[PDB]
Scaffold this active site. Sequence first.
Site, PDB file in Angstrom:
ATOM      1  N   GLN A  11       0.823  -1.207   0.000  1.00 48.61           N
ATOM      2  CA  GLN A  11       0.000   0.000   0.000  1.00 48.61           C
ATOM      3  C   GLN A  11       0.857   1.256   0.000  1.00 48.61           C
ATOM      4  OE1 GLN A  11      -2.512   0.696   3.352  1.00 48.61           O
ATOM      5  NE2 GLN A  11      -3.772   2.171   2.226  1.00 48.61           N
ATOM      6  N   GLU A  64      -3.793  -7.222  -2.064  1.00 53.49           N
ATOM      7  CA  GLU A  64      -5.179  -6.959  -1.725  1.00 53.49           C
ATOM      8  C   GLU A  64      -5.703  -5.741  -2.472  1.00 53.49           C
ATOM      9  OE1 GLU A  64      -6.026  -4.167   0.405  1.00 53.49           O
ATOM     10  OE2 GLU A  64      -3.951  -3.486   0.602  1.00 53.49           O
ATOM     11  N   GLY A 137       2.753  -7.200   5.208  1.00 52.82           N
ATOM     12  CA  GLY A 137       3.086  -8.496   4.643  1.00 52.82           C
ATOM     13  C   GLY A 137       3.361  -8.437   3.156  1.00 52.82           C
ATOM     14  N   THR A 138       2.562  -7.659   2.422  1.00 57.05           N
ATOM     15  CA  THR A 138       2.813  -7.468   0.998  1.00 57.05           C
ATOM     16  C   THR A 138       4.157  -6.793   0.773  1.00 57.05           C
ATOM     17  OG1 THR A 138       0.422  -7.217   0.716  1.00 57.05           O
ATOM     18  CG2 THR A 138       1.834  -6.611  -1.145  1.00 57.05           C
ATOM     19  N   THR A 172       3.794   1.674  13.239  1.00 56.52           N
ATOM     20  CA  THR A 172       2.424   1.433  12.801  1.00 56.52           C
ATOM     21  C   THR A 172       1.828   0.154  13.369  1.00 56.52           C
ATOM     22  OG1 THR A 172       2.793   2.704  10.781  1.00 56.52           O
ATOM     23  CG2 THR A 172       1.052   1.044  10.724  1.00 56.52           C
ATOM     24  N   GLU A 247      26.103   5.021 -11.814  1.00 52.73           N
ATOM     25  CA  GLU A 247      26.986   5.994 -11.170  1.00 52.73           C
ATOM     26  C   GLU A 247      26.696   6.075  -9.672  1.00 52.73           C
ATOM     27  OE1 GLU A 247      29.624   7.260 -13.243  1.00 52.73           O
ATOM     28  OE2 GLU A 247      28.381   5.745 -14.247  1.00 52.73           O
TER      29      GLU A 247
END
Lengths: 433, 611, 43, 428, 428
Positions: A11, A64, A137-138, A172, A247
């Site tokens: 997300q 999701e 998790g994603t 979070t 570079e």
Amino acid sequence: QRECISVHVGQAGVQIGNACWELYCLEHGIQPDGQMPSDDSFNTFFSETGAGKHVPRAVFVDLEPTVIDEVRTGTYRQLFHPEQLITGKEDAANNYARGHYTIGKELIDLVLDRIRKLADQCTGLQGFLIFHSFGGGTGSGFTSLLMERLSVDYGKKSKLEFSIYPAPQVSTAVVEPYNSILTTHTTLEHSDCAFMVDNEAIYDICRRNLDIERPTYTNLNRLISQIVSSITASLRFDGALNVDLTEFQTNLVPYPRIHFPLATYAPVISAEKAYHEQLSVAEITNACFEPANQMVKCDPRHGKYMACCLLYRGDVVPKDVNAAIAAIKTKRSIQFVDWCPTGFKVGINYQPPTVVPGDLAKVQRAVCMLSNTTAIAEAWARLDHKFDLMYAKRAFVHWYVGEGMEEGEFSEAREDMAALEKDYEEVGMDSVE
Amino acid sequence: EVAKLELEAVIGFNGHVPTGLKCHPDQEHLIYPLGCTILIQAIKTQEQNFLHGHSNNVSCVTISKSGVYIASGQVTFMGFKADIILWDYKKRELMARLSLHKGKIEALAFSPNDLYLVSLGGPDDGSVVVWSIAKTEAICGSPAAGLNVGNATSVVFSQCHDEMFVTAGNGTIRVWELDLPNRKIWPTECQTGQMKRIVMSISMASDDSFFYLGTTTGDILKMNPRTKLLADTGPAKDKFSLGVSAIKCLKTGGLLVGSGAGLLVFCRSPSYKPIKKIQLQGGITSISLRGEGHQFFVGTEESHIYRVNFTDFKETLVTTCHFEAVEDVVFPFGTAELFATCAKKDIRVWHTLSNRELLRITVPNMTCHGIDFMRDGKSLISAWDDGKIRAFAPETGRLMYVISNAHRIGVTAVATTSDCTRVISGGGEGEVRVWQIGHQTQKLEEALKEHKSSVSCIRVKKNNEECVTASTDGTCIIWDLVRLRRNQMILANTLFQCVCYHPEEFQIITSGTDRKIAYWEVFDGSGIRELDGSLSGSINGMDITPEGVHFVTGGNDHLVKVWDYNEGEVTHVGVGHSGNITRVRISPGNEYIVSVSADGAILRWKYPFPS
Amino acid sequence: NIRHWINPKKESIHSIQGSIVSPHTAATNRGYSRKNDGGFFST
Amino acid sequence: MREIVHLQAGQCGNQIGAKFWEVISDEHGIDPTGTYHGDSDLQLERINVYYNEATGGKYVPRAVLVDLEPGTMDSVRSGPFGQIFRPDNFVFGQSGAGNNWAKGHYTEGAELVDSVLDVVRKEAESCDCLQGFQLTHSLGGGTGSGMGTLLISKIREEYPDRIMNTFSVVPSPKVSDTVVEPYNATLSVHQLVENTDETYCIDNEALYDICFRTLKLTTPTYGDLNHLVSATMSGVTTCLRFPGQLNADLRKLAVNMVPFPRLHFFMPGFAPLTSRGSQQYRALTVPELTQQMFDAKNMMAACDPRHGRYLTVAAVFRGRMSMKEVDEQMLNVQNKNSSYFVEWIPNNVKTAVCDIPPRGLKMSATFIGNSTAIQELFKRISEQFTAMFRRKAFLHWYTGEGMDEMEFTEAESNMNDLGNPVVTRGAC
Amino acid sequence: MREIVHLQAGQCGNQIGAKFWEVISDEHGIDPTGTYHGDSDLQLERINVYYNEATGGKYVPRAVLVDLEPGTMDSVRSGPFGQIFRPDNFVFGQSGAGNNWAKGHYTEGAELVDSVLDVVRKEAESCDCLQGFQLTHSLGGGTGSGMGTLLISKIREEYPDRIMNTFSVVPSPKVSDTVVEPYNATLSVHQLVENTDETYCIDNEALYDICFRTLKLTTPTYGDLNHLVSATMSGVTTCLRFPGQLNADLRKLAVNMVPFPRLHFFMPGFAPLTSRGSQQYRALTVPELTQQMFDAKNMMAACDPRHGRYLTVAAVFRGRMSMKEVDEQMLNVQNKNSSYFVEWIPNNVKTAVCDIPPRGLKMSATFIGNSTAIQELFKRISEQFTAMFRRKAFLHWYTGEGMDEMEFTEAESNMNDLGNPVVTRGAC
Ligand SMILES: Nc1nc2c(ncn2[C@@H]2O[C@H](COP(=O)(O)OP(=O)(O)OP(=O)(O)O)[C@@H](O)[C@H]2O)c(=O)[nH]1
Ligand SMILES: Nc1nc2c(ncn2[C@@H]2O[C@H](COP(=O)(O)OP(=O)(O)O)[C@@H](O)[C@H]2O)c(=O)[nH]1
Ligand SMILES: Nc1nc2c(ncn2[C@@H]2O[C@H](COP(=O)(O)OP(=O)(O)O)[C@@H](O)[C@H]2O)c(=O)[nH]1
């Protein structure tokens, strides 16, 4: 001609990339339809098609929906090819086991197929810019599996991350230290340069200098979007010091493991503070070197600057750039590591920074410092201490091990982090031989 | 002295009032509420008469069966008393100032033979009160609802005697009986078996057989007042969508029902099967009979007034209005018989002489705060609280462009340059963003901004080189649209809601919450004079005549005043606004004045001077 | 007779993309604070 | 795209689930007839979480309403949003609840549960992907205690990879509405402990106190009582149905909430709570939402958090709002109340944000808390069971309906073994 | 950014504050409804000193009202500015005050003080830099005598870096409206000495002296008495809310007027006070402000300042006025009345000036003075105590509600010890 593929996982990745492509379309003058109103600067982040449609070279992956569906039902629905936006069917649920072991396999083949199909329509590919967090998790497991598969398939490529690190204070999730430790352990050997961005430090910046009192995550993602739009600016426009991704890759990464720079930006002024300010070269260089525009919550004085690159964007003159660098190398508050006398990589471009309808001011100068410093050893250490205190008596371990995770990978991730902190300490001290 | 202009036309109908639009038994006059007044409209001859005196918006209106008494309610503030003004019709005077309720008046009804009035209160009181009509005081009353149920939403008298209150609401069906000998009301509850319904619209027949309740569940339930128990239920299948919000029992056999989706159905009640069904836009809120019932008057919640015939069900849209607050009216450069008005959910253009809608853009729920036509007349620029500035087609309603995420806290004012290239915007944060429009592109030139509050209005010099931005932080900036910075900065101690250049551009005229009109020099931003202009209420909206002699004002005092420039006494003064005036405009032909208010009313004046 | 143009997308009053309003009324900032050593904010 | 199968068991569960369906129908825009009449496309975008699409836009909820006596079915059908439910998934039984766990589980519930499992299987097969099951019931009493836990057992055996939320009304110490509430709650908790992934204990005394002091209500009836329960129902599933920055569904709430599989007993909270008279004097903002969220009077279960250490906390916010204000206030409460949070779990508050608040409001916050203090409920029920079981009182019916002493002993021993970990983490 | 938490205790303090809120809302342009209808923008800039918010700009004071009798709150609600306070801040009790210090301090007062302190905290942490708690009460009587000192003790324990401003109405020598005012005053001063930083003595006989000799009213009311008290309320706090040259807030007043921490008992005065007739023969300027502000006729405590030297004095002015006025006249007074200011402290006069005067006037002045003359006020209560304590009369409620003789001996000893520095520093 000099393209690189953007991957947006999680997300955080999807919303940051929403702000990113919002900046990119007004940078190269592309309307949100794909059409460009009435020169090769667009070929890098956009791809030409008949009747003038410019499709992005981005892969938005999320396990999701509804976050992809914001894009698919928003103002940018026609800009993206509606297959590149790849959705799963179940949320990975803040779990590295779900992200990398169980629900990653229903999309990894499709994501790699579309990475291949976007890569083949590309002459000189410069690499990958991958946007995720060390959080959900994603954004942990799927980017870990992506680093695995991209190391197998395009192992010589450059893979640069723009990661959202868990803040040392605000955080979070409860499962933040577990997920962060696992994703960075699996991604240490395959990631090659990871630019580190922390939301609390963005909070302090947008609270102190940018005069916003209650901003959502959209301002944070826009501020990250400016940083990425100016790390990738010299392969798009023309300047004097033409700098590229490889570079940056060579200049910021001394050791094979030591590849974590911090990104910092010049004026984040909000235009009731700009007309009263010079906005010259030396003072914005000083502002980037100040230990308050740091974009992860760590004190540079509690550490050692070790290798940094300045990316000057806009109406800049190289003599003033050299004068600013000479002034910085004299002050003892900002001190380098004794074995790196050449610790500056200069890259200047002639394109002024654009303004999006947003909050950042119209300026004629900008600097991004990308600085690999030893001061992020502490930022690794607090999250390691959280990992220890939460791993003492099996907190939330059963959720991992019931999905396919093996308990020993928690351990070997912990000693991999121990080796990373040991490497930071070993590169820290001065030479005595 | 103080003269009056003329009441030409008024466009407005508060359709949110349940049982609103009524029909007097004189067969030729409509009784309909709007703002803090009630409008008399004769159908055949089209004259407007105003029923003045209510110190807040109306909430309910009813008429006596004989047709000589009219009652109305208020939505007054929390804790303060509400009032019912018991009007008589034939001489139109404030006969009585009934006041008991600690909230808003919410249901009203007169007796069959005019002796008693009933005053079912609001959601803070929940009480029934009887007022006698001869003495004009209350007789008795009680809590309207039980302590185990909700509140009562509608009340009705009998039709053959004066003794059979019916109160209905959130499962509070009660048949009350007066006992004037000992002066008290007897409540009797009703039990509809296991059914627990929520009632919106109540009615009954000419004789006292049964009373009909339309529910929020889309069924009509008939109940027997005498035996006090339910009898029949509504359309078992095909229940009316939303809910039956307007019901009227016809004399002969039948029922008229109106859903919340506008599904006017003439049904008959062994089964409530639709015999004649008509779709009408807006939620049907009031159903009134023109006498016996050959013609009807349906007032929808979208401020649409419909007139249908019972014998064939054909529809005549006779009055379309603004269903929420109006915020701006504009005139194109040239013809003065088309004017555009924006509102809380829509923008509509009006033909002036017929006072009739011609085109409506219905952007869903987001509020417009200002419109302006381009000089070439090929697009209507509109500022929304989206943060967006749309450009609608002037004839067919098409998005030529949307200016996305322009201003942070909404876009409040827009103006267009005469060269048809620049649109100047102003929003809540105070930015005076100038946007350049080309063939297919729109760009941000430079974000002019000094303000610390919302930009109420932006006016542009006829040379399209200067512009003035009234702000609600007490600042009017004379910007400079060639090199894009500030020239002069007028500072005061008010909140400007209206600024206007002199027509040959010397002095800006500013007003707002100070109740004081001010003329300001543009050399150094000094004050020429500071004259009065409102007894109590912020003055919102001004317009000078193109000649440069007189200007027009109208504010929170619900009363338009036309002032002279060299003078500044009141020249002429018009009254009739049922709410807070938000803008006033003089027509480009210097004939008419169009004044828009916050209740949803478009009033038209005559600009009564030939200059 | 009356012409219409319903917008194809029905937006919501809570999905709008701006800066959120201060609960303290912005013209005369009321509950109010300062910045970390001083500031009259942005409105 | 994720969806929830809703089950109502008992009279309490049926009425609470009904009020759920009024609240969800108000949120999404479905009228009592089943037609979609909303104002925003975001309501219809994820309408397939609770409503199966029917013919002609007549969306029918995926709720199985079961009771052992056909008296509450007629009340729910004759309620306002009563003609929204399918007239076929009303599974009843012409029998009595008995307020007896044996009669609800090892008797007529066991012979209606085939029909119930058939209907739940049909609803759980009419699926693209299901996320799990939520069940509304009351442990104190019958039907929901016996047959509800029986259905929980069968559904957990059938579908083992789905999230279960059980909103259970638990008896109060001030007042009881049934004398065999200790026995029924005991045998229901014995099956709730090793089956469901999330339980939400809802106490009538604490909810009545919420109706007293926060709402300033004079006569809060059952309709006003279950409304807050429906609010905290919709709070946990908001981000499944509506977009927003930092979404959170039931599974990620679970994996972020429960550190051990046995410790999954929560207490809910809903904190835009203003009285009718004091609403006009409120200045609705993130710090006072968090203040009312963590105040020890909005707590839905009758357990004070001041006599326990919070294991984990989650706050699912709804409304357009600043996540500086979110993160800062959650760290203000975490640092100001340091002895009320466990030190072995850092940053022990999950944050969720949604764009869409409930209608009639601007900003809401649903509090879901796994705290220690569930002993003040469980040890209470255990004390009532110990005082009642020793005399073998109110128990001959239980033995005559097909039960032994060993299952009662196992249930009481399992609450002793359930109160043991949640006290040993109170002293680490 | 400095806020003041306002507390109202007792009937007398309730009416004093329920006249202060009217006078300060007249100054700040707030109607009984609560919205702003004023003329100048300079009012609204600094109304975060007494007013918290609501939606729509409907400003609501941060006053915690408390009384053990639920009859004074009804009068406050039914009064002129009654629909402006929070209904949750109406913390009352269904019990009796009883004009009894024991009954307000060690009983039902202590049973209500927790619910009071909850609201005090709910107003306290909703700030940024809280500096002061004001408390309006009467020393003689109940509630404000017992619960007032209990609240001050708990608040001082909770917040030890913020200042107490207690406007206390002391008993009068001419009249007593309760028999046990000496007991209540002695017991209340016992905690007022070692808890408060600015105690303001208001005496009703002195208020009648001002209202009869100076204001020249025939039928004075308690509303008028509370009006003068409210005038000095706003006068003390004007430098927080309105800009002006040489501001001086409450703590800067306290630092300059409290030489020793026990010597903090002040006595105030307001002096643009003219009769309705003799307004015509004033010469509206500064010298008559200075005389009417220094005299022993406008002094709101009935203790003659000519009997004892002024230790320290502040005089805060309001109105557009140059400082030639102020500096010239207060230096003139200090030079010529040299025997009434103690010589060991040079220049014991504090100045502050605010730009905007009170509404309806042009120039106002508010006296505050630490004087030796409070020695008579405390001494008279000492003999009124020892007249009744020797016979142990009016005392069996004091013993019955849970007190002891040693408490009374300690209180009288503390106040007799307080009578020592006021005579030693008077006699150098
Ligand atoms: N700029 C920005 N950062 C975000 C956003 N959402 C989340 N983050 C960051 O991401 C962290 C948690 O979200 P993610 O890690 O992205 O969650 P995810 O990768 O989508 O994985 P899931 O939680 O399973 O959906 C937070 O700590 C934030 O710092 C966003 O919308 N914008
Ligand atoms: N919150 C809430 N609780 C209810 C409601 N109806 C019943 N209850 C509670 O349910 C408990 C008993 O229900 P129960 O006997 O088990 O119903 P049964 O399952 O049909 O046998 C009582 O303690 C009530 O407090 C309701 O509508 N809302
Ligand atoms: N200034 C002022 N003083 C008052 C007022 N009402 C009462 N008093 C004084 O308060 C004293 C007694 O009050 P008290 O007994 O403490 O009130 P109670 O304890 O709540 O019953 C009397 O001597 C009065 O002089 C008022 O309205 N204004």
